[model samples]
Target: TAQTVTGAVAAAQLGATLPHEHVIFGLPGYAGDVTLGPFDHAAALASCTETARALLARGIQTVVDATPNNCGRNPAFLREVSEATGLQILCATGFYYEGGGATTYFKFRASLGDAESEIYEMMRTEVTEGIAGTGIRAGVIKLASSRDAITPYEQLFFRAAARVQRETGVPIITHTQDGQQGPQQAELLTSLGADPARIMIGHMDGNTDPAYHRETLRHGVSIAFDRIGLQGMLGTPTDAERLSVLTTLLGEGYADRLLLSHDSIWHWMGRPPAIPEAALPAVKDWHPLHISDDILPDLRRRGITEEQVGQMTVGNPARLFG
Candidate 1:
């Protein structure tokens, strides 16, 4: 009674997990700026293992790592981590943001139709044959959109992602910029026959406007109020602000369609050399949204019941990934 596409489990059964987070990511184009210093496969595995252990303590069983192609989509790395941690690891297959090195790949691919076919083919092969022969299948389709409008390159990425969803029945998750064009992105995907419920509009918490988030969610898509801490990003809402919005949304009966995460990486491997050694040490242990310490505890403090937290962290994500 499982939803099977091509005889594979469609990731929806991976229960009570966050569908978008980055473990280890380093784009070649941003190599100098975002290089993962001393971040090899072993380090990535250890980091995921620790995170998984934390989640397991809280009864979370799975996590979908949404690091897309050209943004450190390392299936082998994920498999190593999963084997070490004994947590189900769902990997992503697609492109990344427009301004990043992702744009370069788009230029080479020519037209959107051609790019769509290429990405679809890549996804199909990965799902069927294993990614890069690692024997690990990607369970979801990861696509990226900008904070700005859908650029030609981003549009091409979306079109290709939609084609993959159509072909494979794998759900799509997007890294939304700010919260501006989430509704527009939803409309584009829905028009192309993507099930709105199967799509996640991420990083909506970047903007404090609940109405904007509600409008996007009304399109039948899930909203990931993914970032909780306002450390680096401008206009980022506090944990309290985020909780209030979630409470309001749940009260309005939209709790079933929401997901939550801090979008916080355990470590930023690629700190620029320009930062002083003194400053570097300070940045080391600064995961603003540490799942175990800050995010979960803050939710409890904000009057979020255990059940409501589960809905955001567990139930809703399970349904979306399925």
Candidate 2:
């Protein structure tokens, strides 16, 4: 069974899962801003409820919310959203990457020489007991590393994530900066006795290179091309480039090791980066349905069978997260 914001659900019930996405998100410092950081649950519930409805209509049965504990992870709101929309929303318990994550508090804890143990305990408690007294347990452990390397700070979290994953039966989902360090992330986690089959290395679309992907997939862990629509920004490749690489991998018999999603954030906790009028064209289709609406169709048209697509969308997530 997989844990959701609602409760435990069998893996087969998690039909067509989007394993990387968010109901609401904020940057590390967004919660600290006096002007725009305050949350409005009423407004957020309405907005994200509509987003959940759209996803459900498009055949997305489960959404693994990737927002970490310090990054606007609201277990209560997630519970409300799951109940309101009947969407199996799974929340994570962990931290973001070292560079863009909330670092001050953890760094201070590190200075006290207990950050690793503290992180392990925090994740363990959230998964076993609950988060912040909500009794809504986290379903996955999220962790991230710096670009090109895993920093000392991120190493601490990675070790803790591995420890927690070992103690609990839950899986670990990871963020790799700019398509870098997927192999490194897998290597470290698996070295620490984390199950390779229960790990997912996300954002592989940030690099369009087939060789880089093959190297990462060789570690026997799944990879997510979750950022399906955002192109020409954040060092992400165009959808066409992603499709070509994906086709090559599919042909090489790597379908079972792949997962798909949009990594879409339904609502921003505070002021989102208001896309300037001039820049809106770049992200016009950056929504959760991009994969269901556009990318999957393209893959089908290019002779990729429905089974391959289903494996990426359904089978992989079930096996990993279930």
Output the number of the lDDT-best candidate.
2
Every candidate's lDDT: 0.69, 0.88
TM match of model 1 to true structure: 0.84
Model 2 CA deviation exceeding 4 Å by range = none
What TM-score would every model get versus the actual structure? 0.84, 0.97
Candidate closest to the true structure, highest TM-score: 2
Q: Tens digit of lDDT per residue, candidate 2, span 1-322?
A: 8998888999999999998998898887786774755777799999999988998999989999999888888999999998998999999999888788578889898988889999999999999889998899999999988896999888999999888888777988989898899889888888899888999999888887899998888788899988888877757788888889999999999999988888888888777677878667558778888888898888999999999999999999889988
| Runs in model 1 lying further than 4 Å from the true structure | 1-13, 28-39, 111-113, 230-232, 267-303
- lDDT minimum window of 10 residues, candidate 1: 1-10
* Candidate 1 lDDT tens digits, 14-47: 6667666666666555555534555555665666
- What are the per-model C-alpha RMSD values against the true structure? 4.0, 1.2
Q: For each of the candidates, give the backbone clash count.
A: 3, 0
